[PDB]
Amino acid sequence: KKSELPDPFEKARESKGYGEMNDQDDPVTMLLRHKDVRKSAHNYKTFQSGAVPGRIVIPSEVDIRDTRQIPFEVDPPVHGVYRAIVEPWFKRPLQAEYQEKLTAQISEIVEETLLKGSVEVVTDFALRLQSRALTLLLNTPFSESETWISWGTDGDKANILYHYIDEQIDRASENPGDDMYSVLLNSEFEGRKLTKEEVKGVMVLTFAGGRDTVINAVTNSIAYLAEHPEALERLRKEPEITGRAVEEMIRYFSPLTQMGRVVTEDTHVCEHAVKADSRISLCWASANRDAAVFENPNEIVLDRKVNPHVGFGFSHHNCLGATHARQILKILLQTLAQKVASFEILDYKENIEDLDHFQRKVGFHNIQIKFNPL
């Protein structure tokens, strides 16, 4: 029914192993099989991330930005050095105290929604929850979330973000405090301080990498719980399954469908030739439905123990935001289980990704849902 996300890649995954799409006259070969997505994600020499800024993104962003994202657009061994700088900052959501503040934010927004009765989840719920949670990760004042909410859910809009980041970098530059900007400006890369340009590459990536993905993860979870009262019930009675429930939702929703790489030399994948200087994609969504790897791949098995999903990527570039994202979803699932009796989906419109030969439901442009109290 309505919460379903179908697998548009099945026939091609099983028959050829790959697909094609056009994106700004820079054509893509999509890798669809779990085995191949892993081998290719691991093999950075042949399939590289350190390209012209914006080239590995799909759709390509070469025409809307010049700044290199870090560590996203850097290859090992330099990748490892930058990643070691920011990785302790990204593990902060594992702290008790960070989790209490996040529990209070999510709990407050769930109570407000139970009072309003019905709400438009994408904007009134998911975007608010994501913007506020992000203030904990950046360690900025709560109020900064109102600016981010205003941006909503593309050359001129892009520059709104880039210029905002520059202002923040300059402000922290003059008056160092404890926010992520100040921490990055004071960090060392091989015995010297990071430059503003490097900080900008971390921060643009931090804002852009976690916005849409989190908003869809949150929204798709609510949709799914709305149509599956038995799942809401298991989560209430068996809180111990919550962690595995979150991984299973990231596998099935795969909020980030694919990511590109640039092919450095002539080579083959599934007996198919790919020429140097072209792009492939690591199609995480398809790998996460591979019937050679997952039992019942097109359902949510709420307590799945064996779950080698690639929803957060694989090997070198595995998602730094995963710790933050996981805590958001763990807490959300428990807050709904302990406070909401059931839901009704009242009206919706689907967000379909145009991938040329493939049309992929990634979530909802909007969906109106009623929450009833327990």
Ligand X SMILES: COC[C@H]1O[C@@H](O)[C@H](O)[C@@H](O)[C@H]1O
Residue 299, SS3 per DSSP: coil
E-only strand ranges, the chain = 18-21, 28-31, 47-48, 118-120, 188-189, 192-193, 259-263, 267-269, 272-274, 279-282, 340-355, 358-373
Q: Is 317 annotated as a binding residue?
A: yes
Distances, alpha carbon 243 to alpha carbons 105, 232, 287, 314, 358, in Å: 20, 14, 21, 19, 31
Q: Which is nearer to ligand HEM, 116 or 161 (CB)?
A: 161
The answer to whether 13 contacts ligand HEM (rule: CB under 6 A) is no
The answer to whether 210 contacts ligand HEM (rule: CB under 6 A) is yes
Q: Which is nearer to ligand HEM, 74 or 226 (CB)?
A: 74
Rounded least distance, CB 85 to ligand X, Å? 17
The answer to whether 206 contacts ligand HEM (rule: CB under 6 A) is yes
Rg of the chain over Cα atoms, rounded to whole angstroms, equals 21
Rounded least distance, CB 205 to ligand X, Å? 5
Q: Which is nearer to ligand X, 156 or 174 (CB)?
A: 156
Select the span of 182-190, 234-242, 254-262, 290-298 touching ligand HEM (CB under 6 A). Answer: 254-262
Structure tokens at 139: 């360690």
Q: Is 326 annotated as a binding residue?
A: no
Site of tokens 């428990």: 334
Rounded least distance, CB 318 to ligand HEM, Å? 7
Sheet holding 358-373, edge to edge: 118-120, 358-373, 340-355
Residue choice 50, 53, 311, 363 for contact with ligand HEM (CB under 6 A): 311
Q: Is 79 annotated as a binding residue?
A: yes
Cα dihedral angle (272, 275, 281, 287), rounded to 10 degrees?
A: 20
The answer to whether 259 contacts ligand HEM (rule: CB under 6 A) is yes
Rounded least distance, CB 206 to ligand HEM, Å? 5
Q: Which is nearer to ligand HEM, 90 or 348 (CB)?
A: 90
Rounded least distance, CB 280 to ligand HEM, Å? 12
Distances, alpha carbon 63 to alpha carbons 23, 54, 158, 159, in Å: 12, 8, 11, 12
Binding-site residues for heme b, in ranges, read 79, 83, 261, 317, 319
